[PDB]
């Protein structure tokens, strides 16, 4: 799904700061995205990630 996929950096070789929802932690966390590919569990900000995957705020 969108909030259950593991953070995948992708084949690209860039250093892009992004966010993904960690199911274990039950909250969003940082991770470096390569720039291309990967999956839907990839957001620009913590708040946006939490807005899509976070719990009842």
């Amino acid at each position: 799904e969108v909030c259950s996929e593991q953070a995948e950096t992708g084949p690209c070789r860039a250093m892009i700061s992004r966010w993904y929802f960690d199911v274990t932690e039950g909250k969003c966390a940082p991770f470096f995205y390569g720039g291309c590919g990967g999956n839907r569990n990839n957001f620009d900000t913590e708040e946006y990630c939490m807005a899509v995957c976070g719990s009842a705020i």
Binding site: T9, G10, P11, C12, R13, A14, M15, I16, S17, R18, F32, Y33, G34, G35, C36, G37, D44
Partner: protein
């Protein structure tokens, strides 16, 4: 860069380091000086970047440590991305960064020549990939610019290593069959300098690759010679 060695100061005058200030200052990508106000780099490097205001280009650099609050840099006035770019994997992964001011060529920062479709008997056998990327999948940005000699592999041979993607003619690959040396996370945008006739040619731009230095998994770069017309056009007023 993986399987490489520390570079010496002034060794790769055209290599720059692109920093982002948001959310904080850090190396984002590599890039090559092709004009006194032009940096050729990768389009995917600006994934998410809304404004060039958060960008910083540092020329004449060897150790990331050298960057400080007082350290001079070049601001970016405009990010020019190829109008056909969609996904680095598909190709067209190229971008021009137009600096706000001009660079003063010196032994530590100069322009690297572009390839030409008009060149004769071009056989690159002295290629090098440079950058402050990772030294192994899941690593961290290096302080000292890393270099690594890597052999070009034909498009056909590469097409076979990547049965998942469509290695077009606008791309170029490089790497040893057994791997060991390749570009890694943090080297995107970096140059793929190759010696032609005593002259350095910006052959490719670090784009992607399955993993880092994996055997039978060559690095894929944007084939610059195929975009020279675009560059000249975009560099023109």
């Amino acid at each position: 860069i993986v399987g490489g060695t520390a570079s010496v100061r002034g060794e790769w005058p055209w290599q720059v380091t692109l920093h982002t200030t948001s959310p904080t200052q850090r190396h984002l990508c590599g890039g090559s000086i092709i004009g006194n106000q032009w940096i050729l780099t990768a389009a995917h490097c600006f994934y998410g970047v809304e404004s060039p205001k958060i960008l910083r280009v540092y020329s004449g650099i060897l150790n990331q440590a050298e960057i400080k609050e007082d350290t001079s840099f070049f601001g970016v006035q405009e990010i020019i991305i190829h109008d056909q770019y969609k996904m680095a994997e598909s190709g067209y992964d190229i971008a021009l960064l137009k600096l706000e001011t001009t660079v003063n060529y010196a032994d530590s920062q100069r322009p690297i020549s572009l390839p030409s479709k008009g060149d004769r008997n071009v056989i690159y056998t002295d290629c090098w990939v440079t950058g402050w990327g990772y030294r192994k999948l899941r690593d961290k940005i290096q302080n000292t610019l890393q270099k690594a000699k890597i052999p070009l592999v034909t498009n056909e041979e590469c097409q076979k290593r990547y049965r998942g993607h469509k290695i077009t003619h606008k791309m170029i690959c490089a790497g040893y069959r057994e791997g060991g040396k390749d570009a890694c996370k943090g080297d995107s945008g970096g140059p793929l300098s190759c010696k032609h006739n005593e002259v350095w040619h910006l052959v490719g731009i670090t784009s992607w690759g399955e993993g880092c230095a994996q055997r039978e998994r060559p690095g894929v770069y944007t084939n610059v010679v195929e975009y020279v017309d675009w560059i000249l056009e975009k560099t023109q007023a």
